[PDB]
Design a protein around this ligand. Structure first.
Ligand SMILES: Nc1ncnc2c1ncn2[C@@H]1O[C@H](COP(=O)(O)OP(=O)(O)OP(=O)(O)O)[C@@H](O)[C@H]1O
Ligand SMILES: Nc1ncnc2c1ncn2[C@@H]1O[C@H](COP(=O)(O)OP(=O)(O)O)[C@@H](O)[C@H]1O
Ligand SMILES: Nc1ncnc2c1ncn2[C@@H]1O[C@H](COP(=O)(O)OP(=O)(O)O)[C@@H](O)[C@H]1O
Ligand SMILES: [Mg+2]
Ligand SMILES: [Mg+2]
Ligand SMILES: [Mg+2]
Lengths: 188, 27, 512, 470, 27, 60, 54, 347
């Protein structure tokens, strides 16, 4: 996709994540690195000893390299192996987890699937929900999506959709306030 | 505290003491 | 219009109400503290754009960073939490403008705090807009009567200029502004649109109890019907105090662009710099000298530079600014006061010494100056104003010789006494504005030397009695001075003969 | 095709993200999609294909990711006679509403100063009509001139008088660059030049250029609009060997504008908060304003003294570059003397007995020594008075006041304020008038007549008139 | 606390008075 | 910490690729940032303090 | 209208108008029942007051 | 439930790591496993479920990772007639060894200032008995009063005189708040108040409340002790409606306390080191001390002039909020004039 990550950031974790995504996406592969960094995230939270290792800063470079090799030399994309070696040289091992997470974000941005959340006060009947799908489907009609439900609003009989980063307000509460305000500013 | 103002007032007292000291000689 | 006709138009208007909603990007707050909110994502957001939080309070996106977005909370930030939603409205900060603004009290954002009722207005202008160019402006040639003798005579203010009311705490800075608003009330009653001046009072960092007292005085004198009060108190967030001056300025541009005349009064700007400094410091920006931001000069300059005298092609409107500055210990060499002085045209220096010595309004004419000069004064004023300045200039010099004493020449005794009459003449009480024509008569008697006869302690009471006597018996004379605005020779002879005569008639202390 | 794109917007500083072929520093970039033409000047290369620029117009309305076009050259402004008699913007846009500006070609506002071997410095007296100036601080045609003054001291009115006296009747062209000053003064000057026929709508006339960077402009524009006016003078200098009269308004705003953004640019504040590159940034501008083999430029630039503090780094460094200096004193204004030219602080590189006539140099120092002695007597006079002084000291104080009051000269630009018509004083009459006072020609008449007079003869005739009047 | 102004006023004051009489004789 | 100027995208990208090519790191350097008349050069090892260096254009 | 007493059609119509906006790029309340409900009450008063100039 | 965990301890600032449901700003948090219970007010959400808070009591003894419980509400102190004649702590705890305070409700110390509509002038002079005061700067009941003075100039002595002349004869309740002062005066004042019969242990008497934030308390306590006493005064103003005499000892300590902790909170210093939120923080506390339609609060606030520099930002900004001002000069004290009131500076 032009070896250009979704966004460019100067943050520590952002810088490495962007360079890895570009370098990874350059030759042929993006999913291989995604699975590698994901493994560190799962291991970073499941194994307690692994967390203390990365957070450890008083450890020597040569010592860190030996421990990293013991973890695994295969099943990790060369981009991931080269990244780790760079962190050890720059003492940025402590920032490993943030880089891992940050990298997945960019990968999730490339993912086309998106989650749409509908907010409604009154309970959505099985038949009513079906009609909602046709409206959202007919609206886009060119991208698949997954729907999620959450009903705890303050509005009444209003609909508010959240689709990743977009918000469209069809709530009746907005209509009520709009009219009550314009009727007051009539300036008769 | 606005050194420029203090240094000016110090200069004024110096002249007063000078002329005051001179008039004493004439006195 | 019949009641039925208006009701039908009223119903039809309510029928035609449109409401469109489009997809608006939203972002999450990375952190919130001291009113600063770091937002994640929320890309394609414009600088200064308005954003709304979950609670419903608005925000202004000032810092647009590649990583996050720095937003300022336009209100109380207690309900804000990590991960909350932030919706971008899609419009730069703006405030309501129109004629309905007169007679109400609004906040920095423009919401009415009087509690009377909702604001009935349809026009909204952006708070920050590029000032007029060079061609749209025009030379200031109309007087802005404040009602003060010393000001209308020594430091004339023409509609379209910028005068700085600089002084220390409790030196009469607000008293000058109040006297001006009260003076313009008369012109508002009479059907002279060419002299009506809408007043706008911007309160930045002031206790609500004081602002409440301020509004009551306006209503007491019925001068609130043409006054607009913008309130940005200390409890208000720094951005509100930062936008309140520009907010009120936008309300003035309405009258300016509509060929009308408006007077905007900015309260202490040092409080704005603290809020603007606070707002900048909390954004992790590099501070400048005295901890203030580097572009603090651009702040006030951008604000005051908008006040101008539009040309006749755009309606001939004018906007007059009267910014106020509070000094710590009368040191004008500080950073902020020095900048404001270089931006405004003229400045009114208030002295604490003159205030306690009975000289109220405590005005230091030696330093006060105005670019417009006599170009604003009326014909009857320029003639008398010229000699008045020269006479006062000499008196200030001989002040020291009074201590020397041991002898006094005949002329020096006269010049010394003559100047004492003027100083005693220029004194004026609080909440007592004077008419332009009345000042001409009193100021005329002073320069001519007639006040040298009666005792100084009696000159102040003579002023009241003399003016009252003229208003009753000599009414045509006042009308000529007002309408024509010039002191003709016939008026000089008549005025020169009645002034000494009246002093002899009334019971005063004639012994000099 | 736009190569860059907006990435960061904070205040007036804007960063652009380029894909390849980064633009050189000082290059002009055009942002697409803005309601008004926005130009960005490359200032620093931050790496990773990032560049930090300063916005010339209000950054409100911009959007991250907005495409930016690379011009490949610094900000270019129209040059030639088409700009004569027309107001122009920092980026070259006409704000006078008289239509587009016709220019034979476009020159860049950034260029290297002329070499030292081709400096071709020369000294030539410039009769400005002001007696106090032509005597104590003579000006040199083709040399820098400084007007140091505080807030509201009379430096703006003085510039107008020099234009009324120097700009007109000048074979060559003139340029007026007003940076950082209020806009009201600009409209007044434009109407003044129009009424005075200095500028007109009829083509082939208006031998004077106007450039305005008034306060209404945001930072960065006020710091570079000065270069725009200089480029106009450079064109009239190099392309034509014609003497150019460059009237620069207060320049302190230039160094000030740089400090307004120096903090955001990453620089560490200086002792007084200024940028560390004040000397170099200011030096690049002063070195370019100089006479060369091609043409000469007589630059009249004013220096605003904030808080009347001459120790500020900005003006202190300017003194070294100025040939003639005119320091305005506030004490004189309190006395009513105008122009309030400080006779002791004001200096001129031309004030040399070899450069100017020995008589001119003698009369100059004679007045300075006379006033210097009078200033010292003020101390003793305050306590004892002039009466207790000796006859020798009495005469010194007497003539000193008469000469000091005689320095006051009413000009045409001060008529509205004072009400007395302006007056022009020649160099010969100037040196002769003061030379006569130094010898005691006017010691008999009262000091009241030696006030706001042009020539000594005028003061004597006024004195005799007052006698017959009483 | 301003003594410089006191001396300044005394200077201008006495000088004006002194030279004011001299102006009469000169006329 | 905050960041290191030496952690440029050009230099970090070369590391991830795995190619150990510095183009004669010794006696030669690559400009990483330029500002206020001061340009930082990556590499250029074996350069003495206060020593003269020649740029691509020719300036010293 | 916010209360009960035949509020069902208000919500039912709102749902229909809601899905209409979702299916479209924007959302406009052309089919909202609040506006006609208010106009009916207002039109009633207009007819009541509009009797004769007397 | 102890959803929070101490992340880092830096002096009086302590961070807490929560798993979810972060507390709102200004909410009170209680650390577990430490005698002399510690209260932490939420100040900022640093992100990643980390919140920065200020400590009201000494932080010595805290351990990183120690559990912390979320109350979900700001610091609520008891108010009502029970506080009358009772000494309270910055966090509402009684330090007089008199037993638990009997309060009808617990009001939070964080509240918005009264609106513009609910404001009253109350322009009535208050005769204090001091000729120099009543002559130049006569105090008015229901208005804000400010006493400016340096170290050892007669600020405390002047306060004691006002209490003897005004507070005793006063009809309504009173509230005394000490901020960063010597505890000896608090003890002497309490015993002196009992001896004068102004306060007694018998219920129904002691129409005056006592609050103390003496220097012994660490930063954060002296910055919020004022809000504690203020809440006790707002109760009598709104609920009781009667007149109130809010005696406030030196308040510069409040501003100072904020500055002492501002640097720890990551704020950029001000011109002379103060916090950038000095005006706003002080404004919220000053805008609340005002008379309204419900009742009047006559506040006597002492302002300590640091290094006798009236141009300091802290005291300078205070003048704008005060109605009556009484600046004390040290030059007069040298001459023996007491009270050392500056008539030309007391506006
Ligand atoms: N010309 C005057 N004549 C008589 N009394 C005056 C005059 N001016 C002010 N006073 C008195 O001074 C007090 C208010 O001063 P004023 O508000 O005008 O100054 P200020 O600088 O605006 O104060 P602040 O900075 O607190 O707003 C009042 O007690 C008022 O009665
Ligand atoms: N020589 C002078 N001639 C005429 N007016 C003057 C003179 N000096 C001062 N003025 C006064 O100075 C003020 C204008 O100051 P100005 O020249 O505009 O300063 P600046 O150059 O900074 O704009 C006017 O009020 C005017 O009364
Ligand atoms: N009315 C007074 N008359 C005579 N002496 C006094 C008077 N008030 C104070 N002194 C002296 O002034 C000193 C300082 O007063 P104080 O109020 O304690 O200042 P501080 O605010 O620093 O506590 C007192 O210790 C006392 O000895
Ligand atoms: Mg005021
Ligand atoms: Mg000027
Ligand atoms: Mg004390």
């Amino acid at each position: 996709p032009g070896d250009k990550p979704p966004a460019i950031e100067d943050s520590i974790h952002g810088k490495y994540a962007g360079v890895l995504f570009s370098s990874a996406s350059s030759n042929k592969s993006l999913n291989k690195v995604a699975e590698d960094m994901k493994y560190f995230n799962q291991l970073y939270k499941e194994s307690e000893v692994f967390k203390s290792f990365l957070n450890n800063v008083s450890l020597k470079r040569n010592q860190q390299r030996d421990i990293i090799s013991a973890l695994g030399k295969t099943n990790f994309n060369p981009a991931t192996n080269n990244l780790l070696e760079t962190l050890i040289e720059n003492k940025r091992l402590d920032s490993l987890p943030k880089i891992a997470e940050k990298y997945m974000d960019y990968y999730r941005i490339l993912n086309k699937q998106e989650s749409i959340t509908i907010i409604s006060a009154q309970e959505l009947t099985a038949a009513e929900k079906q009609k909602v799908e046709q409206g959202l489907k007919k609206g886009n009609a060119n991208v698949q999506f997954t729907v999620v439900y959450q009903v705890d609003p303050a509005i009444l009989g209003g609909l508010q959709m959240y689709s990743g980063n977009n918000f469209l307000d069809c709530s009746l509460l907005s209509r009520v306030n709009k009219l009550k305000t314009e009727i007051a500013k009539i300036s008769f | 505290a606005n050194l420029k103002q203090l240094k000016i007032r110090m200069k004024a007292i110096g002249s007063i003491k000078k002329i005051t000291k001179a008039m004493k000689m004439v006195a | 219009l019949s009641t039925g006709e208006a009701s039908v138009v009223l119903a039809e208007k309510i029928k035609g109400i449109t409401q469109q909603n489009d997809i608006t990007e939203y972002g999450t707050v990375i952190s919130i503290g001291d009113g600063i909110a770091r937002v994640f994502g929320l890309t394609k957001v414009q600088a200064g754009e308005m954003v709304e939080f979950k609670s419903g309070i608005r925000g202004m996106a000032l810092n647009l960073e590649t990583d996050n977005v720095g937003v300022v909370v336009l209100g109380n930030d207690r309900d804000i939490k990590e991960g909350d939603v932030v919706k971008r409205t899609g419009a730069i900060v703006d405030v309501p403008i129109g004629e309905a603004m007169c007679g109400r009290v609004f906040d920095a954002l423009g919401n009415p705090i009087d509690g009377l009722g909702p604001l009935k207005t349809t026009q909204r202008a952006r708070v920050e807009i590029k000032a007029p160019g060079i061609i749209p402006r025009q030379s200031v040639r109309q007087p802005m009567q404040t009602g003060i003798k010393c000001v209308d005579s020594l430091v004339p203010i023409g509609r379209g200029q910028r005068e700085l009311i600089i002084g220390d705490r409790q030196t009469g800075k607000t008293a000058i502004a109040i006297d001006t608003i009260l003076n313009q009330k008369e012109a508002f009653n009479t059907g002279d649109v060419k002299k009506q001046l809408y007043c706008i009072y911007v309160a930045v960092g002031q206790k609500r109890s004081t602002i409440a007292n301020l509004v009551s005085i306006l209503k007491q004198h019925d001068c609130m019907k043409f006054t607009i009060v913008v309130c940005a108190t200390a409890s208000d967030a720094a951005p509100l105090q930062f936008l309140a001056p520009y907010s009120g300025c936008a309300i003035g541009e309405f009258f300016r662009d509509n060929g009308k005349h408006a007077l905007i009064i900015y309260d202490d700007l040092s409080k704005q710099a603290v809020a603007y400094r606070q707002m900048s410091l909390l954004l992790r920006r590099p501070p400048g000298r005295e901890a203030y931001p580097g572009d603090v000069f651009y702040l006030h300059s951008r604000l005051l530079e908008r006040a101008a005298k539009m040309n006749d092609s755009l309606g001939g409107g004018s906007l007059t600014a009267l910014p106020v500055i509070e000094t710590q210990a009368g040191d004008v060499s500080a950073y902020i006061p020095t900048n404001v002085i270089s931006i405004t045209d003229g400045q009114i220096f208030l002295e604490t010494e003159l205030f306690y010595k009975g000289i109220r309004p405590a005005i230091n004419v030696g330093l006060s100056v105005s670019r417009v000069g006599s170009a604003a004064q009326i014909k009857a004023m320029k003639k008398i104003a010229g000699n008045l300045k020269l006479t006062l200039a000499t008196y200030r010099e001989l002040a020291a010789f009074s201590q020397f004493g041991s002898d006094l020449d005949a002329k020096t005794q006269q010049q010394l006494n003559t100047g004492e009459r003027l100083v005693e003449m220029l004194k004026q009480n609080q909440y007592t504005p004077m008419k332009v024509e009345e000042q001409v008569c009193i100021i005329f008697a002073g320069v001519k030397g007639f006040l040298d006869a009666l005792v100084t302690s009696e000159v102040l009471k003579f002023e009241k009695k003399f003016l009252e006597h003229v208003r009753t018996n000599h009414s045509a004379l006042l009308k000529r001075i007002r309408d024509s605005g010039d002191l003709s020779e016939v008026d000089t002879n008549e005025l020169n003969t009645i002034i000494p005569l009246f002093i002899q008639e009334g019971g005063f202390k004639l012994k000099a | 095709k736009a190569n860059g794109q907006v990435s960061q917007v904070i205040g007036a500083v804007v960063d652009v993200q380029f894909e390849g072929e980064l633009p050189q520093i000082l290059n002009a970039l055009e942002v697409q999609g803005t309601q008004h033409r926005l130009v960005l000047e490359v200032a620093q290369h931050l790496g990773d294909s990032r560049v930090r620029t300063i916005a010339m117009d209000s950054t409100e309305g911009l959007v991250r990711g907005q495409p930016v076009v690379d011009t490949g050259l610094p900000i270019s402004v129209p040059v030639g006679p088409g700009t004569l008699g027309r107001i122009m913007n920092v980026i070259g846009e006409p704000i006078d509403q008289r239509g587009p500006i016709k220019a034979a070609k476009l020159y860049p506002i950034h260029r290297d100063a002329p070499s030292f071997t081709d400096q071709a410095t020369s000294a030539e007296i410039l009769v400005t009509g002001i007696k106090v100036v032509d005597l104590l601080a003579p000006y040199a045609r083709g040399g820098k001139i400084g007007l140091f003054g505080g807030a509201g001291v009379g430096k703006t009115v003085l510039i107008q008088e020099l234009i009324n006296n120097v700009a007109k009747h000048h074979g060559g062209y003139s340029v007026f660059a007003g940076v950082g000053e209020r806009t009201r003064e600009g409209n007044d000057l434009y109407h003044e030049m129009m009424d005075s026929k200095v500028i007109s709508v009829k083509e082939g006339e208006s031998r004077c250029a106007l450039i305005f960077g008034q306060m209404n402009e945001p930072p960065g524009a006020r710091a570079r609009v000065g270069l725009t006016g200089l480029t106009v003078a450079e064109y009239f200098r190099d392309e034509e060997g014609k003497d150019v009269l460059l009237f620069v308004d207060n320049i302190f705003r230039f160094t000030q504008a740089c400090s307004e953004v120096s903090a955001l640019l990453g620089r560490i504040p200086s002792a007084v908060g200024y940028q560390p590159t004040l000397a170099t940034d200011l030096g690049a501008l002063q070195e370019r304003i100089t006479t060369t083999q091609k043409g000469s430029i007589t630059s009249v630039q004013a220096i605003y003294v904030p808080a009347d503090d001459l120790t500020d780094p900005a003006p202190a460094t300017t003194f070294a570059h100025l040939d003639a200096t005119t320091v305005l004193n506030r004490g004189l204004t309190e006395l009513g003397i105008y122009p309030a030219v400080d006779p002791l602080d004001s200096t001129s590189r031309m004030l040399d007995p070899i450069t100017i006539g020995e008589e001119h140099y003698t009369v100059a120092r004679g007045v300075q020594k006379l006033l210097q002695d009078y200033k010292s007597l003020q101390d003793i006079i305050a306590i004892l008075g002039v009466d207790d002084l000796s006859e020798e000291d009495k005469l010194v104080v007497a003539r000193a006041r008469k000469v000091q009051k005689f320095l006051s000269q009413p000009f045409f630009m001060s008529e509205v304020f004072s009400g007395i018509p302006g007056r022009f004083v020649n160099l010969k009459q100037n040196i002769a008038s003061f030379k006569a006072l130094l010898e005691g020609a006017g010691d008999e008449y009262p000091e009241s007549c030696f006030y706001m007079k042009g020539d000594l003869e005028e003061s004597l005739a006024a004195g005799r008139a007052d006698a017959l009047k009483s | 606390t301003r003594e410089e102004e006191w001396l300044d006023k005394r200077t201008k004051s006495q000088e004006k008075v002194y030279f004011d009489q001299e102006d009469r004789k000169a006329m | 910490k905050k960041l290191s100027t030496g952690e440029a995208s050009v230099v970090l990208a070369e590391k991830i690729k795995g190619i150990t090519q510095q183009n004669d790191i010794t006696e030669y350097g690559t400009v990483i940032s330029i500002g206020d008349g001061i340009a930082r050069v990556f590499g250029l090892t074996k350069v003495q303090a206060g020593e003269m260096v020649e740029f691509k254009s020719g300036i010293r | 209208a916010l209360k009960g007493d035949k509020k069902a059609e208000v919500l039912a119509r709102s749902l229909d108008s809601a899905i209409d906006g979702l299916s479209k790029g924007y959302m406009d309340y052309q089919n909202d029942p609040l506006l006609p409900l208010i106009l009916s009450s207002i039109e009633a008063n207009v007819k009541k007051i509009t009797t004769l100039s007397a």
